[PDB]
Amino acid sequence: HWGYGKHNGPEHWHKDFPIAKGERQSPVDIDTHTAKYDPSLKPLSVSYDQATSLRILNNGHSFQVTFDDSQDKAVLKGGPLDGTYRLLQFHFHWGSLDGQGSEHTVDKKKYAAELHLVHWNTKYGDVGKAVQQPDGLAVLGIFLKVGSAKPGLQKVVDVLDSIKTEGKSADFTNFDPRGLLPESLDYWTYPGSLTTPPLAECVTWIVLKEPISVSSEQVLKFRKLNFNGEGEPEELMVDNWRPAQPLKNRQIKASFK
Numbered sequence: 001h002w003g004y005g006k007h008n009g010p011e012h013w014h015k016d017f018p019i020a021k022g023e024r025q026s027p028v029d030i031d032t033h034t035a036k037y038d039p040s041l042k043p044l045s046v047s048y049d050q051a052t053s054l055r056i057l058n059n060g061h062s063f064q065v066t067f068d069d070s071q072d073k074a075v076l077k078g079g080p081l082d083g084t085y086r087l088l089q090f091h092f093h094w095g096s097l098d099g100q101g102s103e104h105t106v107d108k109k110k111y112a113a114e115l116h117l118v119h120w121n122t123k124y125g126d127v128g129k130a131v132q133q134p135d136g137l138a139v140l141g142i143f144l145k146v147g148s149a150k151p152g153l154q155k156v157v158d159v160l161d162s163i164k165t166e167g168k169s170a171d172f173t174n175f176d177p178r179g180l181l182p183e184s185l186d187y188w189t190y191p192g193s194l195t196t197p198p199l200a201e202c203v204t205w206i207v208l209k210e211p212i213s214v215s216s217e218q219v220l221k222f223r224k225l226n227f228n229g230e231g232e233p234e235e236l237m238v239d240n241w242r243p244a245q246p247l248k249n250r251q252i253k254a255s256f257k
Ligand SMILES: [Zn+2]
Pocket: 091, 092, 093, 116, 195
């Protein structure tokens, strides 16, 4: 029953998911002046050359592109991480207008959207077990600003008309997620949570400093999706972001000076 509306949105989630008021919730505001450069942090290793995308799905909260995670084909390592994390899916959060949509913020600045590339720690064997562990998941977060088009996003944009409503999916093979990355892998990192129910406190967040640019036409296509199922009153899938949560006793570390 949870969603992003007045009666089921983020301010309501704690009733079914009390960890919503926990000690390591996401997203957060990244205060750039307070984040500590950590020279012990390693470069991130993003190994997506053998990625195998499977499907694209409207799940009623976002759209997601799903990958074969049954072998080490597209993996995240290094950075703040110990061990190997397999790419399972990516999805986005976005706004009704360009001045909101991101989940993380940077010195209170909201971006138009935020891409989450979701990975799970192979030492737990499957994602269901990983979400029960404090180091179970690593989510790579990438901000989107509106300007020039992102060519590597266009294949995604062009199939969204086929998954307009909740429950629709389509074949989405041979998609290369490397086409969604910025030039720099400079990042901030902190321990946090899933940003949607069940809000499990299982995520090492890795948020890239450099946004990607997408065009107004690309983000407009996101905003034509629907939260509702076919047949139900049409409610545009916009503003599917959770606001910044209290940092509490956490330190955000920077990979860069
Ligand atoms: Zn997300």
